[PDB]
Design a protein around this ligand. Sequence first.
Ligand SMILES: *[C@H]1O[C@H](CO[C@@H]2O[C@@H](C)[C@@H](O)[C@@H](O)[C@@H]2O)[C@@H](O[C@H]2O[C@H](CO)[C@@H](O[C@H]3O[C@H](CO[C@@H]4O[C@H](CO)[C@@H](O)[C@H](O)[C@@H]4O)[C@@H](O)[C@H](O[C@H]4O[C@H](CO)[C@@H](O)[C@H](O)[C@@H]4O)[C@@H]3O)[C@H](O)[C@H]2NC(C)=O)[C@H](O)[C@H]1NC(C)=O
Ligand SMILES: CC(C)CCC[C@@H](C)[C@H]1CC[C@H]2[C@@H]3CC=C4C[C@@H](O)CC[C@]4(C)[C@H]3CC[C@]12C
Lengths: 52, 439
Amino acid sequence: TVPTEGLEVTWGNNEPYKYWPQLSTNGTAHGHPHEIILYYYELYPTMTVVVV
Amino acid sequence: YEHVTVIPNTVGVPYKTLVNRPGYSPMVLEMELLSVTLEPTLSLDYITCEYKTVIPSPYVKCCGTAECKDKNLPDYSCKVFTGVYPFMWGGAYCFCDAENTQLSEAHVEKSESCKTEFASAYRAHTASASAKLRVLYQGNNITVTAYANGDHAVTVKDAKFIVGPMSSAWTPFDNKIVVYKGDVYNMDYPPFGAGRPGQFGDIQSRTPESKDVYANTQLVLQRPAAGTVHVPYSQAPSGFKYWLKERGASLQHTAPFGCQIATNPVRAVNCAVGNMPISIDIPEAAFTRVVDAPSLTDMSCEVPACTHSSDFGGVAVIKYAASKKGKCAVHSMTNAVTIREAEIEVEGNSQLQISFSTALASAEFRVQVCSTQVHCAAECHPPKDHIVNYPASHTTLGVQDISATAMSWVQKITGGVGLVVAVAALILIVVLCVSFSRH
Ligand SMILES: *[C@H]1O[C@H](CO[C@@H]2O[C@@H](C)[C@@H](O)[C@@H](O)[C@@H]2O)[C@@H](O[C@H]2O[C@H](CO)[C@@H](O[C@H]3O[C@H](CO[C@@H]4O[C@H](CO)[C@@H](O)[C@H](O)[C@@H]4O)[C@@H](O)[C@H](O[C@H]4O[C@H](CO)[C@@H](O)[C@H](O)[C@@H]4O)[C@@H]3O)[C@H](O)[C@H]2NC(C)=O)[C@H](O)[C@H]1NC(C)=O
Ligand SMILES: CC(C)CCC[C@@H](C)[C@H]1CC[C@H]2[C@@H]3CC=C4C[C@@H](O)CC[C@]4(C)[C@H]3CC[C@]12C
């Protein structure tokens, strides 16, 4: 699982790998209200819910 | 000119700043941290090492009693056993088969290997900060190394940079550190003079060359089995050896905040906590007068494409009209949008192109080039590759910013509710007041 701050992974004696998430979503912005709520929900799973 | 800015301690991320000196063309500097180091001051308490048990030949005295006296060795005992009748390869040890005694003794001392294989127990207190900084000054990129205490100032092309002092002092190293050959482990060393048998601390010495060794290894001598000369002993196994096998994981692999811990000297590299303030003094000579510099007029902005991705997402085309051919400076005036290109070249009437990376869904950014401000607006669509291997370059986003089509729907709904409340309130106000007039 990848944290929003990024994840570091070390495999054996190899140099460590670093990963970061992007703000990807299956929702849309600038569209219909039911498409916009999904856009923000997926990107911000906690606050979107609290604010709404 | 005195200029002060603050840059986050995240390594490998460029941040940019604008120097405002009215009457002169604006200067833009780009600075990036290449490395940040925290170097703690350590004080050695003691060294833990492997011990060896020394057992000198036994003394065999037949037809008589042997005796031994106390010695001042680190861990020593002696015992005399009676009724011993040992044999040699060629027959019984001696003529006498009665009233025989044997003296056995043993002691513990540091092995010769303690000059190569050892763990040092240190106390930690405070740490000095330093950093490797790369600053783009007028189109040259110069690299400067400075302490971040706030006490070192470095000279780049006749300009003064005084890095520091760091905002927060979280240090990965804890209060007590045990350092083996290559890695630092946070642990609570047992205090000097109190090591329990069989764990870290069975044999402890104050300095590598010191001759005072305190060892509590439980050596108890035992009776020689009949028919032989062996001097049997029972001892807990070496403490250091057991720690080496069951070490756990060193701080380098388990520290918080992405630190890398390296040794000789013990140091922490690239920890991402806090903001390091940078203050720059720029000599008056470098600044260039407004009249000499190119001046830009008639600017309009159209954003062909926007994608909110960590890498530089969108291109913006800006149309400029310029007095003369010269270098010019570009800087965003809103925090969210960051513009990759510091300087672009302008001539005649043409289009300049700047690349922007942002995390804002609908973007409203004012970009200023050579003292004129042009406003650019666009709609951004989300990125479709889920995980990337490079650090995020856009700054973070806050609840203030919601997308434009989002705002409109919020305003309308909230407004509709508000009107209903207001109409209702007016009705109450009227009825209540009329009732007061009525008697
Ligand atoms: C002073 O330094 C600027 C940045 O300094 C860089 O890092 C410093 C710590 C130091 O090491 C310094 O020496 C480095 O130059 C520098 O501006 C530059 O910034 C870019 C990095 O941000 C840099 O790199 C790119 O350019 C290539 C095209 O050139 C290729 O480079 C490859 C190695 O990366 C070679 O193998 C090729 O033969 C070829 O020369 C792009 O293609 C790169 O993107 C692609 O590369 C990455 C891996 O690096 C891959 O994953 C992908 O294919 C990716 O798409 C990358 O963008 C540029 O050299 C340069 N960019 C400019 C000109 O804006 C300047 O030299 C200087 N300051 C300025 C701004 O003048
Ligand atoms: C159109 C109707 C259904 C109302 C829609 C409300 C939407 C547009 C509002 C309500 C909740 C809001 C979100 C609440 C919390 C956050 C997390 C913050 O870090 C970024 C802003 C963000 C993501 C807000 C974005 C816009 C938002 C999703």
